[PDB]
Each structure stands twice: as structure tokens, then as C-alpha cells.
Design a protein around this nucleic acid. Structure first.
Ligand SMILES: [Mg+2]
Ligand SMILES: [Mg+2]
Ligand SMILES: [Mg+2]
Ligand SMILES: [Mg+2]
Ligand SMILES: [Mg+2]
Ligand SMILES: [Mg+2]
Ligand SMILES: [Mg+2]
Ligand SMILES: [Mg+2]
Ligand SMILES: [Mg+2]
Ligand SMILES: [Mg+2]
Ligand SMILES: [Mg+2]
Ligand SMILES: [Mg+2]
Ligand SMILES: [Mg+2]
Ligand SMILES: [Mg+2]
Ligand SMILES: [Mg+2]
Ligand SMILES: [Mg+2]
Ligand SMILES: [Mg+2]
Ligand SMILES: [Mg+2]
Ligand SMILES: [Mg+2]
Ligand SMILES: [Mg+2]
Ligand SMILES: [Mg+2]
Ligand SMILES: [Mg+2]
Ligand SMILES: [Mg+2]
Ligand SMILES: [Mg+2]
Ligand SMILES: [Mg+2]
Ligand SMILES: [Mg+2]
Ligand SMILES: [Mg+2]
Ligand SMILES: [Mg+2]
Ligand SMILES: [Mg+2]
Ligand SMILES: [Mg+2]
Ligand SMILES: [Mg+2]
Ligand SMILES: [Mg+2]
Ligand SMILES: [Mg+2]
Ligand SMILES: [Mg+2]
Ligand SMILES: [Mg+2]
Ligand SMILES: [Mg+2]
Ligand SMILES: [Mg+2]
Ligand SMILES: [Mg+2]
Ligand SMILES: [Mg+2]
Ligand SMILES: [Mg+2]
Ligand SMILES: [Mg+2]
Ligand SMILES: [Mg+2]
Ligand SMILES: [Mg+2]
Ligand SMILES: [Mg+2]
Ligand SMILES: [Mg+2]
Ligand SMILES: [Mg+2]
Ligand SMILES: [Mg+2]
Ligand SMILES: [Mg+2]
Ligand SMILES: [Mg+2]
Ligand SMILES: [Mg+2]
Ligand SMILES: [Mg+2]
Ligand SMILES: [Mg+2]
Ligand SMILES: [Mg+2]
Ligand SMILES: [Mg+2]
Ligand SMILES: [Mg+2]
Ligand SMILES: [Mg+2]
Ligand SMILES: [Mg+2]
Ligand SMILES: [Mg+2]
Ligand SMILES: [Mg+2]
Ligand SMILES: [Mg+2]
Ligand SMILES: [Mg+2]
Ligand SMILES: [Mg+2]
Ligand SMILES: [Mg+2]
Ligand SMILES: [Mg+2]
Ligand SMILES: [Mg+2]
Ligand SMILES: [Mg+2]
Ligand SMILES: [Mg+2]
Ligand SMILES: [Mg+2]
Ligand SMILES: [Mg+2]
Ligand SMILES: [Mg+2]
Ligand SMILES: [Mg+2]
Ligand SMILES: [Mg+2]
Ligand SMILES: [Mg+2]
Ligand SMILES: [Mg+2]
Ligand SMILES: [Mg+2]
Ligand SMILES: [Mg+2]
Ligand SMILES: [Mg+2]
Ligand SMILES: [Mg+2]
Ligand SMILES: [Mg+2]
Ligand SMILES: [Mg+2]
Ligand SMILES: [Mg+2]
Ligand SMILES: [Mg+2]
Lengths: 119, 209, 65, 123, 114, 56
RNA sequence: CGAUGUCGGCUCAUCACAUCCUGGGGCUGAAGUAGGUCCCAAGGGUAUGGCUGUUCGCCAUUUAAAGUGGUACGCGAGCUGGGUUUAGAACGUCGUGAGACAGUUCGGUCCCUAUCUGCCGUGGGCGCUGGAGAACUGAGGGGGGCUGCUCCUAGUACGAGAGGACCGGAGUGGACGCAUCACUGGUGUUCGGGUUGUCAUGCCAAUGGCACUGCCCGGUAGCUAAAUGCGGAAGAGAUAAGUGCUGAAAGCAUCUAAGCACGAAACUUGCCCCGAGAUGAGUUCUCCCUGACCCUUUAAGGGUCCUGAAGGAACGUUGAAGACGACGACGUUGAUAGGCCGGGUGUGUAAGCGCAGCGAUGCGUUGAGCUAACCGGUACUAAUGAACCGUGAGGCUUAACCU
RNA sequence: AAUUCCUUGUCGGGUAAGUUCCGACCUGCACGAAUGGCGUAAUGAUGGCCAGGCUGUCUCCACCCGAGACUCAGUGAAAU
RNA sequence: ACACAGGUGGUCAGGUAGAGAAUACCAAGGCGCUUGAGAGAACUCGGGUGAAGGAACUAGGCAAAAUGGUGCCGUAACUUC
RNA sequence: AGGACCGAACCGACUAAUGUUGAAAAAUUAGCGGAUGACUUGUGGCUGGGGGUGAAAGGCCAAUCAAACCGGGAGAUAGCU
């Protein structure tokens, strides 16, 4: 029983979600709007939005953490240089879920998760 | 004797001077304002109907809010009803606070206990598991045999089987009340009352003295 | 009690085996030889003869010798 | 928290080094024995000459457990070794006249006044 | 909550000393034997400290009369009269449960001089 | 684990008494492009609550 | 016999009284303690182990007691396969032999996704006569009921002593049940660290991947028990065996025929839970709807334009609620969830730089850094303006009423 | 005793207790000398019993991680 | 019978660790196994951990846990040496 | 030196769990025994049904063996259903 717990399983073992959200946090930063399913987008907010709060203090200690959470330097060079001072005053809520209907392959509830200051 | 509608805030402890950790349950008991007193002539029995807490003005409904504006009372979150005893009267909008429990020594905290979901017989009815090895095939936590061979051609009623466990009303009796903290609207009873944190508890004085 | 050995299914359910506990002398005799306990109670009452008489004729030769 | 088949150390000089709880006395279906609870033992190891002998069946009061005892303020006193002091079958009073190591405050009564008046440190 | 964390900070002690795992602490507890209150001392290595505010505890492992003894004192209990840090130790761990299989020269945790 | 009498087309129709689909309740009208869509989802032209959230 | 699977065990059981304990008695060759035996009584309770495939049994040790039986000598579409009904092999034995043995001995496949009744749960439909939101009364049904030891009365009554009470009260235990996480703990592959092999990030440094979470060591919330709170009752009604009172038929006697009182863990209540589908569909409180017309086959009738209420549903954010529905919280007039901020807690002194050192490393920065579900805050993002469903004064007949 | 029906023979060992086991007794129901007798170091996925180590085997089950179960979408069996 | 966890002889044999063609991670290379999306109930399967006890389980330590490498010291009855 | 020892390829198949309308008309997973020999394997050959072959179990001889399979006598016979 799931009393007071948090964190979707998404039918994946724990070393897969950590290496799926790391690909998905990178691809959300890289493209600034991605289309994924609705549970995989609601759990992406708990991963990407702490990687932008880490980006409000450009230090060598925080470069090495946001590289430990993504393992991609192009994403880290966008978090601290571009997306850091882009969200320099927003108190959380750095990204937006846009529900976009159902997927024609498996009837998954899809969603667009975009960054807020995109367009 | 009536009781008072509390709320389970949580559990902590009260150290005595002697070095006795008393596990108390902080029940906050706000002002229980009566909404409807019932009598033998109109309602067929004697009971008051209290309410507690506050509720949003865009969430109380017009049938439910007209019940309070008759009594001259702010809309609380629920409506409970306490059977009056003999020689015990209250008015239509009287506010009742926790100083009713200031001289009792044992209460009966009735709450709505936790919900364990669909829970099997090893958890629900405390059946024994079957043998986890020595050859057991697919039958480690099952109930096993649920009847007899063709003489009862049926499972009997009230059989202990799997199903819902918890989320039912239960009453824990004769809890020793430790502190009636009427300053900050509290009541501390020694023990473990039903229900999770933030649920409604219906604290009544003990029927078993 | 039930017999303990080979022989199949009539062994398996029916009792057909008898132990007799003679209370004052304590001698027990546990006969399970045939298939019916009538031929198996009488072969265990005829041995409480030869285990009580031949143990009182052998007690009164201890106090004879 | 002593049940059947538990090997217990011996905390006096009656003569045993290792005894085994074979029954937990005091009630039907009774699982466990804390401290101050009488168990029935059998002696599995003895000093080569002494007051008791390998294979005796007698009573013992458990004086130290590894599950420990919880004081009324919630504080627990865990030991390392499950150890007991060998009582008698009839009189039910200890045999060796010198207890070894600490005991607890849950042991003392008019029954075991003779143990806490022989122990080095009564915790 | 808030009411919980107000009934606790009016029953805490205001004079709990600052001890770490490894410190050879020396706790004087009350003992009520018969009908007399005396004050028994208990000195040994702290092997764990469990912080929860009022519900705080600390485990002290000594070697009493040859047999190893642990004792989880509730920190804000009214039966621990005086927590006193005799020796301060140096460990790189938070719960010293490796000291249970060590006795003698192997249970030497060195002194923290800072 | 298997039947003894063929259940009827009465019991089959009664078992399927709850297998009937519930339609969409109402479609929400967007306030800029004016077209209908599911309530709380974006439209099929990229609008949601007036604003254009993504190009087609 | 076009198959009704079989002994013992395990997991569940459930009834019977011819009752093992606990309850109430009579009688005793019952002084007390303990018994003996018989009647009443099924409310609960009613061992763990050694050997054996074992039921049975003996034995060790408990226990208030370790009841006797039914239920396909309960229960294999629940489990086990030691035994027994297979094929291999051997011994003893019988037979010239193939082989045979209620003689023994080693080895030897246990299938089925539940249609129906049944049962445990949980919903959908409509009904309850206008519709709706709540609060209940309780017909009925379930759950629970076990008890030890010690102390006081009292070393009193009894007894020659030895010993040793009834009645009554106070504690504290076992077993079981329910709730719970404050404590002691378990787990905590989502938190922090140590470390091995290797690989990658251009390299050193730092880190990540993978090797059962790589192997470990700690651990938050949660759930949990071994953890700690509570529970069995008291009382009341009518009784069983039993003891009586008054009392005739039967001048006496007699508990019974008229009359009357006592009497037990059983019975009806008391206690907890469900509960108006209780179609016998109940009660109370509140809320809402106060428009016009046609038509004929005149009636509890269809139809039209306007109207759409209280409320509910849907969708969304969701939950200490949950298989799915359900139930609960919230929807901008907003803390429902995530983020954010401050704290807590856990790990235990990050990285970078500086220094001491030939170096591994150590030390200062430093209780540093990171810190999941927790706690207190904050509208930063998502919780949409609507729409959809429900209607528009509620039948008939008598009665007390009404001006 | 792979052989013993009576039998759980009796006595001893081991066990708190040992129908098994080991050692003896011989009263061999019905061992016995190449359808071999008795020994036997080594060997055995061999049969029986015991002990240390070890542990959810168990007292008594708790939690967690994954694949199903459950719900939505697609295809869509079976014994009877 | 299947685009089936089975069966099928030869040949080539890179890196680091390793005694190695074991095993771990990799290179050249080749793939992610032709249903997915949620949910995080019972119960089943495959695993991890566990308080105190440690064979009390049981037909039986079945199954799990445990032991595990090299160097050296040391090594009993018996023995066909 | 060895029907020698430990252990992969390889050959087997001792226990367990799964599976039993399976992934598979005997298999997978964790262990397991042999692994320079009475070994194992490729390609051909040879022995034929009362006959083969058998380190012997009535084993095996094309998912079939106390006498293969296919055609024939044949519509054997059936006091049985
Ligand atoms: Mg949450
Ligand atoms: Mg899936
Ligand atoms: Mg991994
Ligand atoms: Mg829940
Ligand atoms: Mg079991
Ligand atoms: Mg099977
Ligand atoms: Mg299994
Ligand atoms: Mg019937
Ligand atoms: Mg036979
Ligand atoms: Mg019969
Ligand atoms: Mg039929
Ligand atoms: Mg259906
Ligand atoms: Mg038949
Ligand atoms: Mg027939
Ligand atoms: Mg048939
Ligand atoms: Mg009777
Ligand atoms: Mg009597
Ligand atoms: Mg009954
Ligand atoms: Mg009854
Ligand atoms: Mg009753
Ligand atoms: Mg009963
Ligand atoms: Mg044994
Ligand atoms: Mg029966
Ligand atoms: Mg019968
Ligand atoms: Mg049966
Ligand atoms: Mg059976
Ligand atoms: Mg059956
Ligand atoms: Mg059947
Ligand atoms: Mg068998
Ligand atoms: Mg069904
Ligand atoms: Mg319904
Ligand atoms: Mg009832
Ligand atoms: Mg806890
Ligand atoms: Mg907590
Ligand atoms: Mg812990
Ligand atoms: Mg861990
Ligand atoms: Mg915890
Ligand atoms: Mg690495
Ligand atoms: Mg490096
Ligand atoms: Mg890789
Ligand atoms: Mg631990
Ligand atoms: Mg009563
Ligand atoms: Mg009279
Ligand atoms: Mg008279
Ligand atoms: Mg009466
Ligand atoms: Mg009672
Ligand atoms: Mg606010
Ligand atoms: Mg929030
Ligand atoms: Mg801290
Ligand atoms: Mg680091
Ligand atoms: Mg540093
Ligand atoms: Mg420092
Ligand atoms: Mg910290
Ligand atoms: Mg934080
Ligand atoms: Mg919060
Ligand atoms: Mg013979
Ligand atoms: Mg013997
Ligand atoms: Mg045995
Ligand atoms: Mg012998
Ligand atoms: Mg011979
Ligand atoms: Mg011969
Ligand atoms: Mg021979
Ligand atoms: Mg489907
Ligand atoms: Mg395929
Ligand atoms: Mg390999
Ligand atoms: Mg596939
Ligand atoms: Mg699961
Ligand atoms: Mg494990
Ligand atoms: Mg354990
Ligand atoms: Mg342990
Ligand atoms: Mg045993
Ligand atoms: Mg047993
Ligand atoms: Mg094994
Ligand atoms: Mg293993
Ligand atoms: Mg060899
Ligand atoms: Mg294998
Ligand atoms: Mg080998
Ligand atoms: Mg032939
Ligand atoms: Mg064949
Ligand atoms: Mg022939
Ligand atoms: Mg012919
Ligand atoms: Mg024919």
C-alpha cells in the first residue's frame, strides 16, 4: 500500500527511470518543448525543475552536479548560461504541462511539457 | 452524556516527573456548536447535533447552508449527533468546548481507521501462511480449505476470507485522558486512537467507567 | 488403530489393528497380523494369557528359588 | 526474548557454561521469556566438577537478554549475551553463590532478593 | 505539525550537552530503589545518536563486568539527570555499530583533538 | 474450471449490461479559434484557453 | 467401474454433548486442603517437543485444561507425497520355472485461466410517487465472552497436628483480538557515504554507466511487530439443575396444584461494527422550481415555444481513499498536487583552492556539502468562461381540520 | 541384518525425551561360504543417524525491488 | 506444425583485470528480443533485507543461507603405503 | 605416468522451483556429475520385425515396441456395448 509515498514506477526498474529521465531532462532543455505521455511528463517536473534551480548559481561545484545529473555538457552549458538567468526570478514552476489528447498507437494520454519562457 | 468531535493532530509523549513516557495522542477539540436539538415530541428521541471547524462559502451547498442559518451558526465541516442522556439539555446554537472533559478520567475515541485496501487473509484475519518450502506449489499465503466435502455443499456465512481491511469505523475504549488543555483547544489521551493524522475523531466519555 | 504396512486400500482406511493395555500389570500386546480385528483382538487376548500367567508362574519361581 | 531451543550462557559458578531453554514456564502457548521469567533448561556443557552436571533438567531465571528490557520511559537496556542463573526444581532459588556480570532492575523482588544481593552491578 | 511541535518544545531540556558518536559520555541516571532516589552513573562509548527533537535518543555501549551492555537513553527524558562528555572521540561514521564485534584493542577509537 | 450448461443469450446480454460505452459529455469551445475540443486539452490547431501554445 | 482420487500432515474450519478446564449445584465413607460421583451448562478456552510415513502410542516438559465425536472416519479444481496401487533393484521366503508375498528394503511426473450455486469484498441500475443535500431512529444481522499466579481478608474458620479455606476486594501475567507508529526495532533498490574490477566523459581532478541496489555501511516518510495503548467486564431481565416460603388435594407430611422469593460463563439485553432494498422502502431538518399554449381518441395523455432551478455528474489538480468504479479534499473568490523558500532529518567535514608530506594521504576552509515521501510557508506552473444532466409546484379517495 | 514375524526384543551409548541410529546379546519366524561367506583403505549427484557452521526452514511473518494480476487501447484462443 | 527460450559440425579469438577459451566491463561489430500506456491491491513467479531465537520446520536441513582465492605454517583414525 | 585431481568448451541429467490448454508433445533458471578417456563429435557405411541391437532397463529400432510402420487377407471375430 502506497500511503504517503511519492514517485511513479512507470513499469521500469529503478536504474531505468534514472537513465530515462536523464535523457528526457536533457531533451527538454535542448528543445524547450517535448511531447511525452502525461505520467512521464508529471514526473519530469520533479527532475527538470530542480536542474534549473541548481542553475541559478554558476559555480564549479554546481557545474559538476548538473553534469552528474545529466552527463551531457551541452545541456549543462544551456542550464547555467541560458536557462539560469532566463528563470532568474521565477520561484519554481519553471515548466508547463499541456495535455494534448491521446496517442494513436496505444491510447496513451499525451502531453506537451514545455519550458515557461519559450514563446 | 454527550461527547465532542475532535481531530487527530498526531502523537507525542508527556514525561512525568518519575520518568514515565506516556504516549499521548493530541486531539484538538475545537468549539462544537450545536445545530439541531432533537426531542421526544418531534424527533422521537433526545439528541443534539453538533458541528465543528469552518468550511468554504463556495463549497457549502444551499440545502446544507440553510440548515445552519436556521440555527444561527457558522457552517462547519460536518454534522455529528450525540445522544443526550436524561437530565441534560443544550440549546440550538450553544458552543461546547473541551472543558466538558475536564473532570472525566476515561474516554472512548471513535474514529474512522486507516485503509489497508484489498488485503489478503494473512494480513486481514491473521491466518497462518502455508509452508514456504518442502515442496509447496503456488500456495504460500492462500487461505487453503474453505469448507467440507458435499455435506455442506457451501461455504458458510461469515467466512474469514480476503477483502477490504480497514477504512471502517472502530471504537477504542477507556483511554486514560492525560491532559485537557483548554487553553489551546486540546485533549491528550494515553494510547493509540483510530484513524490517520487529520481525520475526525468522535471522543465520548467511557460507558465502561 | 490403523495397521502400518503394505497391502493397499483396505489397509489404508479400516483400523484392523489392536493394542491392549492391561492396566494393573502394565503388559501391553500390540497385535496387527490379519486383516480383521476380530481375528486380531482374540490373538491379543490369548497373549495376555501367556504374558501374565507365564509372568506369574515366573514370579513365583523367583520366590521359590 | 528466550524461546525453546535457545542456547543460554550461565551467569554463576554453579557449574554450567551453556544451557538450553527447553520450555517456557508460566502459561499455555507461551512463546517468549524476558528477564525475571523462569525457564526450564537442560545443561549442555559443564565445568568438569561442580554442583550441576551435563544432562540435568532444572529451572533457571533469565537475568540478561540480547533483546533487552524497556524501562518505563521507553529506554531500553540491551546486553550481548542471553544468560541465566540456575535455580532449583523444588525450592526455585539459585545454586551457585556468585553471580557474574550485570543484572537488571526488573529482577528484584522478594523472590530474587538473593540474586540482586550477589550481583556486581544492578543496572 | 505546529501543535505537536509546541507540546514538545515546552518539555525539552535546555541543557543537553553537545556530544557526537564516539564520545565516552558519562550519564548519571536516577534510580528509585525501595523508596529512595539515588543517582547511578553509566559511562561508555556513544555508538548512535538519534535526533528527533523531544524524542531524541543516544545509545551508549560500555563493557560492564566483562559483558557488553548497550543502553538507549532517551535524551530529553527526566531520568537522565546529567549527560557529561568525559572523552571526545574521532570517527568517520554516524552510527558505530562496528564496535559490537570488536572488544579490547580493536575497540580503540582515537581521540578527536579539535 | 469449466461450465456444465451453456449460458444463454440472456445471461450474455445481462453480463454486457455494463460494457456499454459512455459518450463524451460536452466539448469545450475555445475562445479565440472558436473550435471545439476536449475540456482541459489543447485543440487540434494548437490553441489552449485563447493562446497559441504550439504551431501546427 | 463411458473414474465418486486414497493414509498421515499442513492451512482453514464448522456443528454435537455423552464436558477436559472455567460456571452453577445434589450426595459423600465431604473436618479443612484436595477429592469421589451424579444432575444442569456449548459462552469461551482446549500444549510444545523426542522416535515412527504414521493416526495410534509411549516418553520429556508444560498447562486452568491439553475433552470425546460428526462433518466423503471434514478439507489434494487449497497444499504436501513419507506411506500406500505401477514400471527398476535386492534380501528373506514359496515355486523346477515365469513370477509371487497385510514380509522387508533403496528409487519413483499430483494437471485444470471458475460458467453456475456458495462465500468475502466493492460497484452500476432502478425502486421508496415532485426533485435534491444532509442527519439519524434500529426491525434485523455480525463481532466479543478464555484465564493463571501473587497479595489482603487470615495463618482466620476448620484441625489433634500436618496443613489450610468459602464469600469479598486489590494487583499483575499468559493466550487471543482490535487500533496504532510516540517510543525500541525491521524494511526503506527513490537519501548520504565507503569501496572493488572496468569503461566513458580530451586528460589530471571530479563524476556517471554497468557488474544481484556491484559488494557493503548508516538511514527520512511509509508500511510494519517483536513495539505500547485498549479490550473480555459490572449491572439488568427471564431461567436450567438446585435450594426455598406459604400451602392444600391427603386434618399429618409436602417447593406446587392456586400463590411467592432465590438461582450459572448458557438465554434476551448491556459493550463494538454493519444496518430503511426494514418493497413493512420509516423519521427529522434544510433547499429549489409560482411560463404561455395547442390538439382529441378526456387521461395519472401526447406535443410545441420559452425556461434549466436546488443540486448532481463530467473534466482537471488529487488523497494517510483505492484493483477498477467508490469515498474524501480542491478548482483562481484557490494551498489540491508539483516546484520554490525556510526548517527538520539522514549521511558525516563535498568540490575548488591553500598548506604539511618524496608520495599514498593528512589538515585548514567545514558539522562542510548534498538531503526522497516529512513539517511550516509561498500562487511560480497546472487546476477554464462555459457546456451537459435535473425541471416549471408534485396523483386519487376518505378523515380530522379551515374561513 | 537390504534378511527378525513376534518387536518399538532386551541391555548399553547418544537425547530433557531416540519405533530411527551405533555397539553388543543369539531365542537365525526364514544369514552362510563363487544363484559366494566375512572383512575392507580409497571412491560414490549412493541409503540411515549425529555434530559444529549457517540461515525465513520455523516461533511469525514484516518490508522493499522487478514480471504478471488490475484499468485503458489493438488483435484475439480453449477445454466444456 | 509457429517469425517457437529447444537442436545443429568446422573456422577467426582484439583491450583491462585474470591461471584462463572462466568471469566482470569494453573495442571492430551487431542489436533493444513485432503489443504498448497507466496503476503500484490480493495472490503467484524471480530476487533483496531482517529484530531475538537458530532445525524448535519437516517424511528429510527440501530449499535457502553459509564455505569459496593464493602464499605459508599445520594436518587424526585408519592405510592396499 | 594415470578409465589421476580442481575446472570451462563439450558430453551428460542428481535435487529444487517454474512450466503442465507451456516458450518447448520433457524445457528454462539457480545449483549438479564426467571433462586424455570404457571419452566425445562430423561425414558416409552396415545389421530388419520373431528379426536387429542392447556395459541388460523389455531398453531402443524415425515424437509408436512384451514384437515397428504401410498396404493386403478384411467388412477377421465380438454370446459384449
Ligand atoms: Mg504525496
Ligand atoms: Mg505494462
Ligand atoms: Mg544496476
Ligand atoms: Mg491506502
Ligand atoms: Mg506454517
Ligand atoms: Mg507442479
Ligand atoms: Mg514457490
Ligand atoms: Mg441443500
Ligand atoms: Mg500387494
Ligand atoms: Mg470402513
Ligand atoms: Mg452436464
Ligand atoms: Mg463486461
Ligand atoms: Mg467407480
Ligand atoms: Mg456404464
Ligand atoms: Mg461421467
Ligand atoms: Mg448435559
Ligand atoms: Mg462434587
Ligand atoms: Mg459454539
Ligand atoms: Mg449456542
Ligand atoms: Mg451472554
Ligand atoms: Mg468452542
Ligand atoms: Mg535431532
Ligand atoms: Mg472429524
Ligand atoms: Mg465412519
Ligand atoms: Mg478425510
Ligand atoms: Mg486429504
Ligand atoms: Mg476438494
Ligand atoms: Mg472436487
Ligand atoms: Mg509416497
Ligand atoms: Mg465472479
Ligand atoms: Mg447499490
Ligand atoms: Mg448478537
Ligand atoms: Mg515506528
Ligand atoms: Mg515517525
Ligand atoms: Mg532503524
Ligand atoms: Mg539500504
Ligand atoms: Mg521506519
Ligand atoms: Mg566507476
Ligand atoms: Mg581519474
Ligand atoms: Mg555501458
Ligand atoms: Mg541495520
Ligand atoms: Mg451477567
Ligand atoms: Mg412448608
Ligand atoms: Mg399445611
Ligand atoms: Mg430472578
Ligand atoms: Mg469471565
Ligand atoms: Mg494562502
Ligand atoms: Mg505544495
Ligand atoms: Mg543532524
Ligand atoms: Mg563525493
Ligand atoms: Mg573540502
Ligand atoms: Mg573541524
Ligand atoms: Mg547536515
Ligand atoms: Mg530541501
Ligand atoms: Mg507540505
Ligand atoms: Mg532371516
Ligand atoms: Mg534404547
Ligand atoms: Mg530423524
Ligand atoms: Mg547393530
Ligand atoms: Mg546367497
Ligand atoms: Mg552357492
Ligand atoms: Mg556379492
Ligand atoms: Mg484488453
Ligand atoms: Mg518474434
Ligand atoms: Mg563469457
Ligand atoms: Mg515480444
Ligand atoms: Mg508487486
Ligand atoms: Mg536473503
Ligand atoms: Mg532473522
Ligand atoms: Mg541477530
Ligand atoms: Mg524435529
Ligand atoms: Mg513436529
Ligand atoms: Mg541443498
Ligand atoms: Mg546460495
Ligand atoms: Mg580423469
Ligand atoms: Mg544447467
Ligand atoms: Mg572435473
Ligand atoms: Mg515382429
Ligand atoms: Mg521412439
Ligand atoms: Mg505377434
Ligand atoms: Mg477372411
Ligand atoms: Mg468389423
Amino acid at each position: 500500500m502506497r500511503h504517503r509515498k511519492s514517485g511513479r514506477q512507470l513499469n521500469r526498474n529503478s536504474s531505468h527511470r534514472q537513465a530515462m529521465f536523464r535523457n528526457m531532462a536533457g531533451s527538454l532543455v535542448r528543445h524547450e518543448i517535448i511531447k511525452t505521455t502525461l505520467p512521464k511528463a508529471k514526473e519530469l517536473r520533479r527532475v527538470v525543475e530542480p536542474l534549473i534551480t541548481l542553475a541559478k548559481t554558476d559555480s564549479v561545484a554546481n557545474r559538476r552536479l548538473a553534469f552528474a545529473r545529466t552527463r551531457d555538457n551541452e545541456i549543462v552549458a544551456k542550464l547555467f548560461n541560458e536557462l539560469g538567468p532566463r528563470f532568474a526570478s521565477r520561484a519554481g514552476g519553471y515548466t508547463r504541462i499541456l495535455k494534448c489528447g491521446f496517442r494513436a498507437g496505444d491510447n496513451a494520454p499525451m502531453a506537451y511539457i514545455e519550458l515557461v519562457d519559450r514563446s | 452524556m454527550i461527547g465532542l468531535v475532535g481531530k487527530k493532530v498526531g502523537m507525542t509523549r508527556i514525561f512525568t516527573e518519575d520518568g514515565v513516557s506516556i504516549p499521548v495522542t493530541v486531539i484538538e477539540v475545537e468549539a462544537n456548536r450545536v445545530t439541531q436539538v432533537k426531542d421526544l415530541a418531534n424527533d422521537g428521541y433526545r439528541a443534539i447535533q453538533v458541528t465543528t471547524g469552518a468550511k468554504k462559502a463556495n463549497r457549502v451547498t444551499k440545502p446544507e447552508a440553510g440548515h445552519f442559518a436556521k440555527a444561527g451558526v457558522e457552517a462547519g465541516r460536518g454534522l455529528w449527533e450525540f445522544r443526550l442522556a436524561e437530565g441534560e439539555e443544550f440549546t440550538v446554537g450553544q458552543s461546547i468546548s473541551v472543558e466538558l472533559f475536564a473532570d472525566v478520567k476515561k474516554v472512548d475515541v471513535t474514529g474512522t481507521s486507516k485503509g489497508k485496501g484489498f488485503a489478503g487473509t494473512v494480513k486481514r484475519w491473521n491466518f497462518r501462511t502455508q509452508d514456504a518450502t518442502h515442496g509447496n506449489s503456488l500456495s504460500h499465503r492462500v487461505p487453503g480449505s474453505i469448507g467440507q466435502n458435499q455435506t455442506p455443499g457451501k461455504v458458510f456465512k461469515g467466512k474469514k476470507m480476503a477483502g477490504q481491511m480497514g477504512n471502517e469505523r472502530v471504537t477504542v475504549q477507556s483511554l486514560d485522558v492525560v491532559r485537557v488543555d483548554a487553553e489551546r483547544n486540546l485533549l491528550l489521551v494515553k494510547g493509540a486512537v483510530p484513524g490517520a493524522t487529520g481525520s475526525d475523531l468522535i471522543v465520548k466519555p467511557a460507558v465502561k467507567a | 488403530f490403523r495397521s502400518s504396512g503394505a497391502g493397499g486400500q483396505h489397509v489404508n482406511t479400516t483400523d484392523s489393528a489392536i493394542r491392549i493395555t492391561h492396566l494393573p500389570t502394565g503388559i501391553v500386546v500390540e497385535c496387527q497380523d490379519e486383516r480383521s480385528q476380530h481375528k486380531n483382538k482374540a490373538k491379543a487376548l490369548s497373549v495376555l494369557g501367556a504374558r501374565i500367567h507365564a509372568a506369574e508362574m515366573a514370579k513365583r519361581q523367583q520366590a521359590e528359588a | 526474548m528466550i524461546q525453546e531451543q535457545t542456547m543460554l550462557n550461565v551467569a554463576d559458578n554453579s557449574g554450567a557454561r551453556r544451557v538450553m531453554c527447553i520450555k517456557v514456564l508460566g502459561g499455555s502457548h507461551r512463546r517468549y521469556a524476558g528477564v525475571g521469567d523462569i525457564i526450564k533448561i537442560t545443561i549442555k556443557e559443564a565445568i568438569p566438577r561442580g554442583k550441576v552436571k551435563k544432562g540435568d533438567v532444572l529451572k533457571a531465571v533469565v537475568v540478561r537478554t540480547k533483546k533487552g528490557v524497556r524501562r518505563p520511559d521507553g529506554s531500553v537496556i540491551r546486553f550481548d549475551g542471553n544468560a541465566c542463573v540456575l535455580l532449583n526444581n523444588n525450592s526455585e532459588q539459585p545454586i551457585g553463590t556468585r553471580i557474574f556480570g550485570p543484572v537488571t532492575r526488573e529482577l528484584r523482588s522478594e523472590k530474587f532478593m538473593k540474586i540482586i544481593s550477589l550481583a556486581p552491578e544492578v543496572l | 505539525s505546529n501543535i505537536i511541535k509546541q507540546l514538545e518544545q515546552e518539555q525539552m531540556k535546555q541543557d543537553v550537552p553537545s556530544f557526537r558518536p564516539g564520545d565516552t559520555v558519562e550519564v548519571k541516571v536516577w534510580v528509585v530503589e525501595g523508596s529512595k532516589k539515588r543517582l547511578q552513573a553509566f559511562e561508555g562509548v556513544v555508538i548512535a545518536i538519534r535526533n528527533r527533537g523531544l524524542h531524541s535518543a543516544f545509545t551508549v555501549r560500555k563493557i560492564s563486568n566483562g559483558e557488553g551492555v548497550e543502553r538507549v537513553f532517551q535524551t530529553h527524558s527526566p531520568v537522565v539527570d546529567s549527560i557529561s562528555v568525559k572523552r571526545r572521540g574521532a570517527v568517520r561514521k554516524a552510527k558505530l555499530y562496528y564496535l559490537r564485534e570488536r572488544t579490547g584493542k580493536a575497540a580503540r577509537i582515537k581521540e578527536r583533538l579539535n | 474450471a469449466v461450465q456444465q450448461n451453456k449460458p444463454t443469450r440472456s445471461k450474455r446480454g445481462m453480463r454486457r449490461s455494463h460494457d456499454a460505452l459512455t459518450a463524451v459529455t460536452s466539448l469545450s469551445v475555445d475562445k479565440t479559434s472558436g473550435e471545439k475540443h476536449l475540456r482541459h486539452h489543447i485543440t487540434a490547431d494548437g490553441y489552449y484557453r485563447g493562446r497559441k501554445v504550439i504551431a501546427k
